[PDB]
Write an enzyme that holds these catalytic residues in place. Sequence first.
Site, PDB file in Angstrom:
ATOM      1  N   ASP B 217      -6.806  -2.946  -2.194  1.00 22.12           N
ATOM      2  CA  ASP B 217      -6.264  -3.967  -3.088  1.00 22.12           C
ATOM      3  C   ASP B 217      -7.343  -4.264  -4.123  1.00 22.12           C
ATOM      4  O   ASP B 217      -8.083  -5.242  -4.019  1.00 22.12           O
ATOM      5  CB  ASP B 217      -5.856  -5.217  -2.315  1.00 22.12           C
ATOM      6  CG  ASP B 217      -4.967  -6.144  -3.126  1.00 22.12           C
ATOM      7  OD1 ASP B 217      -5.033  -6.109  -4.373  1.00 22.12           O
ATOM      8  OD2 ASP B 217      -4.193  -6.911  -2.517  1.00 22.12           O
ATOM      9  N   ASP B 460       4.765  -5.726  -1.122  1.00 20.69           N
ATOM     10  CA  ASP B 460       3.459  -5.768  -1.751  1.00 20.69           C
ATOM     11  C   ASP B 460       2.382  -5.797  -0.675  1.00 20.69           C
ATOM     12  O   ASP B 460       2.651  -6.097   0.491  1.00 20.69           O
ATOM     13  CB  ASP B 460       3.346  -6.994  -2.659  1.00 20.69           C
ATOM     14  CG  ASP B 460       2.257  -6.852  -3.698  1.00 20.69           C
ATOM     15  OD1 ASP B 460       1.902  -5.705  -4.030  1.00 20.69           O
ATOM     16  OD2 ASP B 460       1.760  -7.888  -4.186  1.00 20.69           O
ATOM     17  N   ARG B 520       3.150  -0.653  -2.956  1.00 18.16           N
ATOM     18  CA  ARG B 520       1.909  -0.461  -3.694  1.00 18.16           C
ATOM     19  C   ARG B 520       1.043   0.629  -3.079  1.00 18.16           C
ATOM     20  O   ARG B 520       0.543   1.500  -3.795  1.00 18.16           O
ATOM     21  CB  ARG B 520       1.125  -1.773  -3.758  1.00 18.16           C
ATOM     22  CG  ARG B 520       0.318  -1.945  -5.027  1.00 18.16           C
ATOM     23  CD  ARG B 520      -0.030  -3.402  -5.263  1.00 18.16           C
ATOM     24  NE  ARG B 520      -0.739  -3.996  -4.138  1.00 18.16           N
ATOM     25  CZ  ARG B 520      -1.147  -5.257  -4.096  1.00 18.16           C
ATOM     26  NH1 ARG B 520      -0.899  -6.096  -5.088  1.00 18.16           N
ATOM     27  NH2 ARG B 520      -1.822  -5.685  -3.035  1.00 18.16           N
ATOM     28  N   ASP B 536      -1.389  -3.737  -9.925  1.00 16.98           N
ATOM     29  CA  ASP B 536      -1.481  -4.840 -10.875  1.00 16.98           C
ATOM     30  C   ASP B 536      -2.440  -4.431 -11.984  1.00 16.98           C
ATOM     31  O   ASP B 536      -3.652  -4.337 -11.761  1.00 16.98           O
ATOM     32  CB  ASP B 536      -1.956  -6.115 -10.183  1.00 16.98           C
ATOM     33  CG  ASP B 536      -1.040  -6.543  -9.054  1.00 16.98           C
ATOM     34  OD1 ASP B 536      -0.004  -5.879  -8.843  1.00 16.98           O
ATOM     35  OD2 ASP B 536      -1.356  -7.543  -8.378  1.00 16.98           O
TER      36      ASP B 536
END
EC number: 3.2.1.207
Lengths: 100, 862
Positions: B217, B460, B520, B536
């Site tokens: 992430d 997510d 993701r 993102d």
Amino acid sequence: KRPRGVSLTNHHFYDESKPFTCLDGSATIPFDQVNDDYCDCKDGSDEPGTAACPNGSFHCTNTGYKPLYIPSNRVNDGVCDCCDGTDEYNSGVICENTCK
Amino acid sequence: VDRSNFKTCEESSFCKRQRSIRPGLSPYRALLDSLQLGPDSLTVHLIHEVTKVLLVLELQGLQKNMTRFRIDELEPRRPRYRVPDVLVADPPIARLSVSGRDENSVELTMAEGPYKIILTARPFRLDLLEDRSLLLSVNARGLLEFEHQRAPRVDEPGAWEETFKTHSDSKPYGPMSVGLDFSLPGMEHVYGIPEHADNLRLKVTEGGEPYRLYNLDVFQYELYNPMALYGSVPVLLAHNPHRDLGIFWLNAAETWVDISSNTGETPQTDVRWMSETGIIDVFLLLGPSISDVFRQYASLTGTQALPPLFSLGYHQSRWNYRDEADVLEVDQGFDDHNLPCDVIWLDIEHADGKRYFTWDPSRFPQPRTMLERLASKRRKLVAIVDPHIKVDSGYRVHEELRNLGLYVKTRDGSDYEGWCWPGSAGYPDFTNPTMRAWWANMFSYDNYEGSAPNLFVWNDMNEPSVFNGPEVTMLKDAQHYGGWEHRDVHNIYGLYVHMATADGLRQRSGGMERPFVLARAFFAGSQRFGAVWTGDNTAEWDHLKISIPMCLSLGLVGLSFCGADVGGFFKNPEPELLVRWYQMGAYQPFFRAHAHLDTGRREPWLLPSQHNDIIRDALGQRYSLLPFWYTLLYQAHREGIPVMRPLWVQYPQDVTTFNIDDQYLLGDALLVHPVSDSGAHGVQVYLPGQGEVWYDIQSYQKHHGPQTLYLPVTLSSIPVFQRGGTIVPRWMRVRRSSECMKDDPITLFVALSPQGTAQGELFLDDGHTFNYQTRQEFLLRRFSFSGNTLVSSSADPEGHFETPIWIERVVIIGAGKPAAVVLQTKGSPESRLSFQHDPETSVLVLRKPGINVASDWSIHLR
Ligand SMILES: *[C@@H]1O[C@H](CO)[C@@H](O[C@@H]2O[C@H](CO)[C@@H](O[C@@H]3O[C@H](CO)[C@@H](O)[C@H](O[C@H]4O[C@H](CO)[C@@H](O)[C@H](O)[C@@H]4O)[C@@H]3O)[C@H](O)[C@H]2NC(C)=O)[C@H](O)[C@H]1NC(C)=O
Ligand SMILES: [Ca+2]
């Protein structure tokens, strides 16, 4: 006996006997071509009652509600845009007379 | 990004150990006396001349120009990890036969084809050949490294108990890292290993960090770095004008890929893989073409799952909506401005204090009567269901995920409880098959309360993203299902979350309705479950330019349903950048607009009037091209060729298209060069192909390739070209969504080749059901134009679909004045068709064929 999608104001420009004119002026078409499900006219005039035009509109006369010109893409889309659902007639979705 | 939060190769203990080994004579040598040719595979033993611990090499031919080899250890001590659930099936075997034997080498023909594998014994070096031409050499430089299970000791620092920043990683097994190098002669261009914010063609990592494949992430990631992004697919395709191969390194652990190339005689590219654990499982895809390696890889992992039609449209997402009222007003604002919107997307705030599988009784008081008025206007809703489960006595999910032990467990044996946004969050063992079965059961219409058939799920942070974890992920010593450490099963975790959610959305309908899921993090084989998007990304012009390479690289490995966030996620865009992002996004497979808390509301109808009609035109183009998208997603579903494909995929011999990442191909028909510059007055479009004509999709102006044309652009222009020789279907009656559009008349845009030919396909189905497969209720039509005749036939005779779609218009680009146009059908009289010929653009519009797409017909330009 006005064509589909036309207001009383819009009903004299459409004549069954005469060939239909673009209502703004590009070319004339045979009346069998009005509301034939094809965009014969650039203005979108030929198809007041069908969703065939990217620029046309459907006049919905409502008894007891304001008459409204919905976009032509909202005709026969399965969603009842007009208070009196004249916008849906061949889509399989039936509406109610909510003109109260 | 905070670079002092993730490990470089020097901070990763195994990477700095594997990389330390340098090209030299390989200590691993094959002993051609344990060489055992079984009916399926060849087994040999390699010896380390210094360590004297012998590994087992298993070579296997496969029935599709393919070779799988696995290096494990003879005496394991502890079994190493072999990745499951990635291969869609056990690959078919093409047997090996000794074409010749030597005192040092063995050559083995695969089945009876032109491929022979030459296995030397001092040192060990595999040599795949096609007849007499070298294709790729394994362990050619002597970088085969296999760290065996050491005796329990906790020498070199980091080979045992380690600390990155403040997080302990007590490796109970020590160094178990594996590594191998492949020399590809003649290849200078390598692509793949996606989710790296870099160019499509991979760079040589000789004086820098190698490419990391680690699901992380990464908060506010930068660009043009080899840092590991949210996903990881360990596939590397090499390209030459003559031969194209691929290397599939099946390993679900932390992997570093070192790219090397010689200066200098014949060109060569050396690719070095170093994985943290597991075995050396390598599939070698021997081409010989781009379309062949895609089909081979699709036979390995699987094909891109066919999406439902509404997911091919436009999805609108804000950083959640404050209540049901905000969703109702966003739907009404899309209806009022006559913008086509398909799905409305809800973020984490919709959950009951970040508690998924439920809705707050005050934030969303009537969840299932919100979808009722979202289905009345025929739109879909997407919620958020992330793996981490909040800790509560009132959380039924947590009270069952802890009662039935299905959480990931830390090193001592207690449940992992990393502090994510949902309070103290327990992370579940998605590796566990019995947990994915529990996960799938809870998407049912009884378990998920306030759920409707138009409610879909986006997972997510399935990396997993642990807030108080090493880097931003779970500790590597966490114990997963089967006794495996998290270090072995990291990159497979996101694929497991995606698979469990996809089977959850599949089985609530009963398997009938197709499931749309967006993830993701992912792995190899994640194309079979849904869409993936590039995390993102900030709202800058550089992140819009890099949108194409990260989706082109994703499409190369089967994940052809790629997309980026329209308008970015960070650093809210200017109106011009938001306009240009809606134009590119309309030509990526996934088209979603997402926002953040720090950004304002970026809805299309709070923009300037010039900046709102341009976007409205951009959405109209995508919805019009939706039949083309549905056909293209079906081709990716059958043969695995990507929807968004580079220019060298269709033009392999063009050495100009190799480094092109600003243009892409939507199949074989459309070439797209979206504009990404502040106030760009023109684009430079490379039109490839010797003897090819490209027609501007707006102006119908033909250009002869191969050339580099300067196309002047305004804010309203999306530079899309149609290849001469293709037929593109379109729905020219754009409605509010793709739910009545699916039954709207089709128009065919026919672009003529210089020989006057054209060819195209059209795929039709109900668009939301698994009925094209079980009952074959699909319809694949082939439209061909030869001589002066446009014929329609069936490209798949078993597809019988009854649809109200008819052909309302035929657009022939590059044609001439016919003076007579006829339509022939199933014995009905030959009804002459009206036509309008524009001579300046040379475009012939055949008016109202009025014929159903199911029936065969022939238009004659007499
Ligand atoms: C598995 O591998 C086999 C063997 O490698 C492979 O079959 C091969 O297919 C290729 C590509 O079709 C063949 O190569 C062709 O050979 C003919 C005859 O020499 C040439 O005329 C062809 O040239 C064409 O390519 C040009 C490129 O510029 C084009 O201008 C034009 O199209 C030319 O006509 C081409 O070189 C090869 O002969 C066969 N070999 C064998 C033994 O069959 C097969 O496709 C692979 N299958 C799978 C499942 O992957
Ligand atoms: Ca309607």
